[PDB]
Symmetry: C2
Subunit: 149 residues, 2 copies
Amino acid sequence: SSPGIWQLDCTHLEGKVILVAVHVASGYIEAEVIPAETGQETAYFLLKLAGRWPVKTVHTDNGSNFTSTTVKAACWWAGIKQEDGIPYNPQSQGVIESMNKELKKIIGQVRDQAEHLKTAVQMAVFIHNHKRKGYSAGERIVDIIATDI
Amino acid sequence: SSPGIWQLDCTHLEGKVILVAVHVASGYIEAEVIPAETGQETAYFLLKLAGRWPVKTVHTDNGSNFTSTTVKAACWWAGIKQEDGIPYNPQSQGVIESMNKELKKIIGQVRDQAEHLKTAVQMAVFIHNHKRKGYSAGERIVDIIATDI
Ligand SMILES: CC(C)C[C@H](CNC(=O)CCCN)Cc1ccc2c(c1C(=O)O)OCO2
Ligand SMILES: CC(C)C[C@H](CNC(=O)CCCN)Cc1ccc2c(c1C(=O)O)OCO2
């Protein structure tokens, strides 16, 4: 069910890891900076996400997170169906690749306004979610979910 | 105005600080655990919040955060109108007091399922936002904002 489908995405910058969740139908994102991708960090990120939006299904970003007993525990706790992130539809790869490039571009544009990478990432999330393309990703996710309710 | 109005709230547990943002019209919350309330932490919290929901006005929780140059910078950056949290309507105090008590109750109910307080707080956010009272706070915030769009 489209309103509840999210995709995990992990990208790298400044020797750190940026963990991203994308709401597939809208392009809306949430992101955090972590020292490295672990099952524990991914699990905690999902708990946060699921308390904020009605997360039904998550396409996990890799096999280690898919396998992680802590990720499995969090998905159980939060009522999330854990699925693989295998792009059966092959355009899914390019969309995420493009989003990572786009996010890094925005991060570079704001980078000098913040001391810490985590702050620049949140500024980039803001800009991404507010950008009109016409509705913004923030507007689309709200409309999609409201219609579903 | 109503769709974009949030209230900051700071409460204490286990020698730590729980920073809460409440969407006044719906009762929907976002929360984080921090070692202590500083302007820096409050500012960062607001940047995160504003990238995720259309935050127009924030009733700050105290005068130190209202005054903080870092909080002011974040509100400027994110297009947030910073206001005081003075309850001209005196029922506002009791509503927040009650929410803090309610949150702590839920935290106590989940506390043994997580090692770390921050995790229990996110579990409590989840339970709070999903609880049907009939719509949940999560459903109400989405409806309110969608209608506004
Ligand atoms: C709001 C922005 C224009 C300036 C804030 C204040 N920053 C500055 O004024 C310094 C910018 C000069 N390079 C950024 C900020 C807010 C809150 C934080 C931060 C940072 C950050 O700088 O990363 O770290 C964690 O908590
Ligand atoms: C999902 C929950 C039932 C179990 C997770 C795994 N926890 C356990 O199984 C231990 C439970 C001990 N009572 C909780 C968890 C997930 C992710 C984290 C955590 C914690 C946490 O425990 O606080 O800390 C930071 O990152």
